[PDB]
Ligand binder design. Structure first.
Ligand SMILES: C=CCNC(=O)[C@@H](NC(=O)[C@@](O)(CCCN(Cc1ccc(-c2cccs2)cc1)NC(=O)[C@@H](NC(=O)OC)C(C)(C)C)Cc1ccc(CC=C)cc1)C(C)C
Ligand SMILES: [Cl-]
Ligand SMILES: [Cl-]
Ligand SMILES: [Cl-]
Lengths: 99, 99
């Protein structure tokens, strides 16, 4: 698709068999989702946003569908204001910025 | 141009007579720049993201040039850890996400 930016670029994702809404965020290196359950072991990560730093749980090699496009990669879980899909997965689904 | 998301999408902007580097950020409602002087009226604003909120000064009707594209809009100035171009100016230069 081509998505304009007059509104927030919110899309539906699917992860662990469940649908969620998430923001396509080119300003984020990483993908971070609100508290949820994921399989396997996690590692610690600190990520920085406009307000400072938070600790999140890093899960690797997680299948996730984004607007129907299949990806498998690293998903961080922690206290984010919204689910955000960052460049690590935007690249997997072939996303570019164009003007 | 077409901009890849393998790396952070950084561009040069011209604003208030100054050249600055900024991040094209589809996850940001607003454009936020590190401390700088701008002309005209302003009002205080709190903006939030991962890590919490910071206080900024809101200036309206500010001319900016982004990759040779001229636009005008609201610019927030404060203690942001990085300069971000938000949707309010991305729209004006006809920036879209594509995949
Ligand atoms: C005010 C109205 C609503 N709010 C916003 O629109 C705000 N947007 C936003 O905060 C976002 O667009 C994020 C902006 C991009 N941000 C910039 C950034 C980059 C590096 C640093 C650091 C460098 C060195 C030390 S720190 C700090 C900040 N990057 C990140 O945060 C990513 N960090 C990262 O990549 O590591 C380098 C992260 C996501 C943590 C992985 C997302 C968003 C969050 C919350 C809501 C609430 C919506 C209901 C919407 C969208 C602001 C900006 C208008
Ligand atoms: Cl990844
Ligand atoms: Cl504006
Ligand atoms: Cl348009």
């Amino acid at each position: 698709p081509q998505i304009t930016l007059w509104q927030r670029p919110l899309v539906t994702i699917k992860i662990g068999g469940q649908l969620k809404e998430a923001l396509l965020d080119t300003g984020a290196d990483d993908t971070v989702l609100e508290e949820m359950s994921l399989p396997g072991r996690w590692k610690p990560k600190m990520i920085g946003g406009i307000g400072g730093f938070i600790k999140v749980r890093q899960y690797d090699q997680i299948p996730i569908e984004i607007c129907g496009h299949k990806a498998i990669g690293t998903v961080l879980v922690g206290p984010t204001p919204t689910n955000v899909i960052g460049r690590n997965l935007l690249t997997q689904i072939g996303c570019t910025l164009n003007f």
